Design a protein around this ligand. Structure first.
Ligand SMILES: C[C@@H](C1CCCCC1)n1c(-c2cc3c(cc2Br)OCO3)nc2cc(C(=O)Nc3ccc(C#N)cc3)ccc21
Ligand code: NA
Length: 556
């Protein structure tokens, strides 16, 4: 009588009509007094006996089996199921009626094909699971395992490797310390950066706009850290509600992916202004705003399967309510794996490829412009110290080509200036005057007039400081900031993005493959070190924003 004993645990035993109107052991009356009097045979007046419950429950089971064999969609599955799983099917028919269970056409076909795991997942996403989760879990487990374990042992604790981490000092001492540091450092730093970009930056370039959302993504996550620190200090125990847990989870992964996308935009935008600069600083800004809105809305849509799933679970053995750290429904690991594998490819690797190659083109272009300005001054310094006509004509020729290449290059100042603008035409014209004078010294150098061409070098010095040096004065300083910028971003990927996304796939891959993951400790440290991006983000603003440097230095 295992089926009879199983149902008693699910339906309970009550001798009075109660709201789930039912009575006895899961005997449905109506959707109640009149339906009970003719079912028993007498006027029970709402209260039945302990003996009449058993007699009516034993008849409900015999009828639940007859309907199964009567049904053309329930009989073949029932004939394929082992006696343990047969009770689970009868448990559903006992609860949802013959017709209700017959609606699960796809899962019943899976159960017939002995695919217990696939059938379990299908049953986990239904109104049945939504209305009675604890009830459905026990029945679903009976299908998946084929044992009575779901009714013998109630949930008590997680795996040993997780239970030690959730009670160890790594989570209860190390994490809140690191999180506290980030809060003190990242909140006012990004707080001031957002202030500078909005109320102190009067350029409003596409770079400022991307950095403003970067600081905003930082702020919208760091503000919740006081609740995050308290969570860990008290032994990974959440007492603030399920909705507020899913908020922190949402804003955590949001800043995680906004940072990557806004890093790719900034890096590409700043690289694009050097290779092929344009001249619509007002339109390119509006575009950059729209791109930010598109990114902001795209992440709001992609973090939906994080807002809406149960992310809290009470662990009896630990007496704590964990947020995020433990997955309440171990049947969704298949969905979780694909989800974080999609993001790791399309929102991690793909933006990393565009981010890395952007600095490849950016640094090289800034390195070439540096070499031109250096070849110019060096060859101009040789002429004043060369005696033979060979070194004079040779230095003039190398200086000529150096100025012809710098003419095609974008000056550090005219970044948002289009190549057809007057500013660019005056820049190039400054070289046309210089190049012409080099030909006037080459005219003498090629006509054998050695010393007369050396005197022209002093004339070339005047043209350098007047028309050229003004634009290329601090081009080597701009290259150094770009290199440091490439280093800052590379470090942010090496510490905050790559360990998280890599382990996120590995973590859910092992729970899907073995039911436990030994990288659980690394998974937690990865997620912890991922929050450092908002502490490294101020270094990005320092190397990109010029107005932010002023407010950074003046403050300290
Ligand atoms: C557009 C922004 C705002 C920018 C203005 C300050 C409020 C945030 N935003 C972000 C966000 C926050 C971020 C971020 C990226 C995003 Br897309 O980076 C770090 O912080 N998450 C957001 C979430 C919501 C909502 O009601 N959801 C929601 C509610 C119920 C259910 C169910 N069932 C599912 C989802 C609304 C705006 C959100
Ligand atoms: Na960030």
């Amino acid at each position: 009588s295992n089926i009879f004993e199983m149902l008693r645990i699910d339906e309970g035993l009550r001798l009075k009509i109660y709201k789930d109107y039912t009575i006895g052991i899961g005997h449905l009356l109506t959707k109640a007094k009149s339906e009970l009097d003719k079912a028993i045979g007498r006027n029970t007046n709402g209260v039945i006996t302990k003996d009449e419950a058993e007699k009516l429950f034993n008849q409900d089971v015999d009828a639940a089996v007859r309907g199964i064999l009567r049904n053309a969609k329930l009989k073949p599955v029932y004939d394929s199921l082992d006696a343990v799983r047969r009770a689970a099917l009868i448990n559903m028919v006992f609860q949802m009626g013959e017709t209700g269970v017959a609606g699960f056409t796809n899962s019943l076909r899976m159960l017939q094909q002995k695919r217990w795991d696939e059938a379990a997942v299908n049953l986990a996403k239904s109104r049945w699971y939504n209305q009675t989760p604890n009830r459905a879990k026990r029945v679903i487990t009976t299908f998946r395992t084929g044992t009575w374990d779901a009714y013998i042992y109630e949930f008590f604790s997680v795996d040993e490797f997780s239970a030690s981490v959730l009670t160890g000092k790594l989570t209860t001492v190390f994490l809140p310390i690191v999180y506290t540091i980030v809060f003190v450092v990242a909140l006012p730093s990004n707080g001031m950066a957002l202030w500078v970009f909005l109320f102190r930056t009067k350029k409003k370039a596409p770079a400022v706009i991307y950095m403003a959302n970067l600081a905003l993504a930082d702020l919208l996550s760091v503000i919740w850290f006081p609740l995050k620190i308290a969570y860990h200090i008290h032994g990974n125990n959440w007492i603030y509600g399920e909705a507020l847990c899913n908020v922190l989870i949402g804003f955590f992964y949001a800043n995680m992916y906004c940072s990557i996308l806004f890093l790719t935009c900034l890096s590409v935008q700043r690289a694009w202004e050097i290779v092929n600069p344009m001249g619509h600083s007002r339109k390119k800004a509006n575009i950059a705003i729209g791109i930010s809105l598109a990114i902001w809305l795209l992440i709001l849509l992609v973090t939906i399967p994080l807002y809406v799933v149960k992310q809290t679970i009470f662990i009896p053995a630990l007496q704590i309510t964990t947020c995020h750290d433990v997955l309440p429904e171990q049947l969704l690991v298949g969905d979780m794996f694909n989800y974080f594998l999609s993001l790791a490819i399309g929102v991690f690797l793909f933006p990393a490829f565009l981010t890395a190659s952007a600095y490849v083109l950016m640094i090289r272009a800034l390195a070439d412009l540096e070499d031109n300005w250096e070849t110019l001054n060096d060859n101009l310094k040789v002429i004043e110290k060369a005696d033979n006509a060979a070194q004079v004509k040779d230095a003039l020729t190398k200086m000529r080509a150096a100025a012809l290449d710098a003419q095609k290059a974008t000056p550090p100042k005219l970044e948002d200036k289009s190549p057809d603008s007057p500013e660019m035409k005056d820049f190039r014209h400054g070289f046309d005057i210089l190049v012409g004078q080099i030909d006037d010294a080459l005219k003498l150098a090629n006509e054998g007039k050695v010393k007369e061409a050396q005197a022209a070098a002093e004339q070339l010095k005047t043209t350098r400081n007047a028309y050229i040096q003004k634009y290329l004065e601090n081009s080597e300083k701009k290259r150094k900031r770009a290199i440091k910028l490439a280093v800052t971003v590379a470090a942010m990927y090496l510490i905050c993005f790559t360990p998280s996304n890599l382990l996120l796939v590995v973590h859910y891959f092992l729970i899907k493959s073995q039911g436990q993951s030994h990288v659980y400790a690394l998974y937690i440290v990865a997620l912890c070190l991922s929050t450092l991006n908002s502490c490294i983000d101020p270094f990005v603003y320092y190397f990109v924003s010029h107005d932010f440097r002023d407010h950074a230095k003046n403050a300290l």
